[PDB]
């Protein structure tokens, strides 16, 4: 079927520029226009312009200053968007969208891709600091402070999955992540059963296991 | 440049009809399209050229577009139905999103939550660090607000709080943190989470003396 799928998630410092793509397929390339939607954390969806695959002409919008340039490339059926002068309010999400027809005619976007982050910082890449949080029921893990996103967190191995809810990662405004997991468990199991939580932070090659006593 | 203004907020029980409305200069002279967001996930069009339906969307979206103002109907709502709606226009050249609705469908009876708060682990402590972790679990509507005390005094420095996230359940569940220094944790008699939900709202109590 049509499908957008756009690259992989980028982290960048204030002043940058980053390049993302979109990859089309399911269609004729060269007979639609490629849209770029960005959406701040908690925002509305923003448009950023189009280009027509065929003949190349663009649309941007004026709210960003010239800081953006869309160009595609026909044989590779991908479209791509390049940000310059990156700044924090540029975190979000970036969407590309195919139009109706060239965006010329009924100007609405008939298929979405699925989105990619760019994250926007001056931090450093920073391995977490993992505490228990003990029970006394529920208990968990404390990943404090590390950066980029993301951690993933696992117990017992990956054993342990039910009753385990992984919450979303806060930013702080020391511009570093935290986030916590928590297990609610039988207080029978607490002292004979055994409780690691597993903590993975990929850009800093930190693997932590913490086990979680009463 | 143009403005879409749309209501930030629409809330409904399933069965019944929701409206979003969406208002512009022009309006009239322009094709109105509308899309669904639902959490985490990519936009899908659901109405475009005013009241056009794509394929595969649910016959119960319905649009108009009349004085200046396009309408989203979504007759017999349903918990699906959930999502942030947009409105979308054009106007010189330029594609236009409106400011966009949540709309809530409460499709649970509401649950209070289960509030759970953890003292800083002695492991932190020793670090030279103390973050208080406030649990909240097992609340419907997903809709909370956080408040911490020292004492009886409101915090208004060092904390974060998570968006609600649905549980395996259905319910929700969040996060806050209270980020201090081991002095100041030790320093005080007590610190409280207060967790409103619904006008009601649930408090734990953790000491440095416990």
């Known amino acids: 079927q049509v499908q957008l799928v756009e690259s992989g998630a980028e982290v960048k410092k204030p002043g940058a520029s980053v390049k993302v793509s979109c990859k089309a397929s399911?269609?004729?390339?060269?007979?639609?226009?490629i849209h770029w939607v960005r959406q701040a954390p908690g925002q509305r969806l923003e448009w950023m312009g189009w280009?027509?695959?065929?003949?190349?002409?663009?649309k941007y919008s004026q709210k960003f200053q010239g800081r953006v340039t869309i160009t595609r490339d026909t044989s590779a059926s991908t479209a791509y968007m390049e940000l310059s002068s990156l700044r924090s309010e540029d975190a979000a999400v970036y969407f590309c969208?195919?139009?109706?027809?060239?965006?010329?005619?009924?100007?609405?976007?008939?298929?979405w891709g699925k989105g990619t982050t760019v994250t926007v910082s001056s931090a450093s890449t920073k391995g977490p600091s993992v505490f228990p949080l003990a029970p006394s029921a529920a208990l968990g893990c404390l990943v404090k402070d590390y950066f980029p996103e993301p951690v993933t967190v696992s117990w017992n191995s990956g054993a342990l999955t039910s009753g385990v809810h992984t919450f979303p990662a806060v930013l702080q405004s020391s511009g570093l992540y935290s986030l916590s997991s928590v297990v609610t468990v039988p207080s029978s199991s607490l002292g004979t059963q055994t409780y690691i939580c597993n903590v993975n932070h990929k850009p800093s090659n930190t693997k932590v296991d913490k086990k979680v006593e009463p | 440049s143009y403005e879409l203004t749309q209501p930030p907020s629409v809330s409904v029980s399933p069965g019944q009809t929701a409206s979003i409305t969406c208002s512009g200069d022009?309006?009239?002279?322009?094709?109105a399209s509308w899309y669904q967001q639902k959490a985490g996930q990519s936009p899908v069009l659901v109405i475009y050229?005013?009241?056009k339906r794509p394929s595969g969307i649910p016959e119960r979206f319905s649009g108009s577009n009349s004085g200046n103002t396009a309408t989203l109907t979504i007759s017999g709502t349903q918990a699906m139905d959930e999502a942030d709606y947009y409105c979308?226009?054009?106007?010189?050249?330029?594609?236009?999103f409106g400011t966009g609705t949540k709309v809530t469908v409460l499709g649970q009876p509401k649950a209070a939550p289960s509030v759970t708060l953890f003292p800083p682990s002695s492991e932190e402590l020793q670090a030279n660090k103390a973050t208080l972790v406030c649990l909240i679990s097992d609340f419907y509507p997903g809709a909370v607000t956080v408040a911490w005390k020292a004492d009886s005094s409101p915090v208004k420095a060092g904390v974060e709080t998570t968006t609600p996230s649905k549980q395996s359940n259905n319910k929700y569940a969040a996060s806050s943190y209270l980020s201090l220094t081991p002095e100041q944790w030790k320093s005080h008699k007590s610190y409280s989470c207060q967790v409103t939900h619904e006008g009601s709202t649930v408090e734990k109590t953790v000491a440095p003396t416990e």
């Open positions: 969208a195919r139009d109706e027809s060239t965006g010329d005619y009924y100007y609405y976007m008939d298929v």
């Open positions: 399911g269609y004729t390339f060269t007979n639609y226009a």
């Open positions: 280009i027509n695959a065929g003949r190349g002409n663009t």
């Open positions: 022009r309006l009239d002279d322009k094709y």
């Open positions: 050229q005013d009241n």
């Open positions: 979308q226009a054009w106007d010189s050249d330029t594609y236009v």
